């Protein structure tokens, strides 16, 4: 399956290609394997095992990026200034910093302990055509965060990932990209790992 972007006027060339990638890349075995991987990753995050996540699920070369895209006119060509702000754009050391901040006993915001619940759906995977150790993964996430009796925030995202197979059998995240769908989130902050 291929999308004709001349007729399908709302579809970006990027999204069209990517759809094709994942369509032809379908593999039943891979689907099961990646589904398990993402369920494990989400469980680990839900119980706030951030160190274990960073050590065992995240590769040293990680780029962990979440953007907020400025809303531009679909017909406004001339204005070429950067349209994306990086809410996250983290390497391993920067994730380490954020993880440390999370577990510090003087993180006042974390007391009483926050509650996280993650819902992962619509998992699609494809082996890279060049680098077969690289797995392209798409998945949708609902993340519910509750704290302080009556604070509830719900996040909605599509994670566009590259994962890498490791000698020994593990699989680690080398890139996560999220184009966050709400330009102005009404969630107090976005201090969650999507």
């Amino acid at each position: 399956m291929m999308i004709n972007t001349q007729e399908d006027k709302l579809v970006s060339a990027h999204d069209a290609e990517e759809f094709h990638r994942f369509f032809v890349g379908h593999d039943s075995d891979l689907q099961q394997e990646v589904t398990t991987l993402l369920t494990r990753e989400a469980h680990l995050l839900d119980i706030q095992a951030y160190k274990a996540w960073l050590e065992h699920f995240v590769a040293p070369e990680i780029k962990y990026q979440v953007i907020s895209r400025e809303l531009r006119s679909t017909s406004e060509r001339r204005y070429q200034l950067n349209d994306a702000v990086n809410l996250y754009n983290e390497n391993y050391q920067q994730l380490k910093v954020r993880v440390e901040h999370q577990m510090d006993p003087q993180n006042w915001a974390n007391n009483p302990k926050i509650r996280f619940t993650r819902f992962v759906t619509n998992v699609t995977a494809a082996k890279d055509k060049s680098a077969p150790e690289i797995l392209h993964v798409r998945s949708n996430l609902i993340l519910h965060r509750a704290r302080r009796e009556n604070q509830v925030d719900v996040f909605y995202a599509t994670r566009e990932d590259k994962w890498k197979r490791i000698e020994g059998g593990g699989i680690k995240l080398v890139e996560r990209f999220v184009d966050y769908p709400e330009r102005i989130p009404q969630t107090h902050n976005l201090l969650v790992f999507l």
């Binding site: 990086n86 809410l87 996250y88 754009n89 983290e90 910093v97 954020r98 006042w108 302080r148 902050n189």
Partner: peptide, 24 residues
Amino acid sequence: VADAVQRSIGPAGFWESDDNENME
């Protein structure tokens, strides 16, 4: 610099998140 500003005090900033409960 642009990324570092958001990293500390943007919507996902790890400093500014501390501040929410002070302000709110």
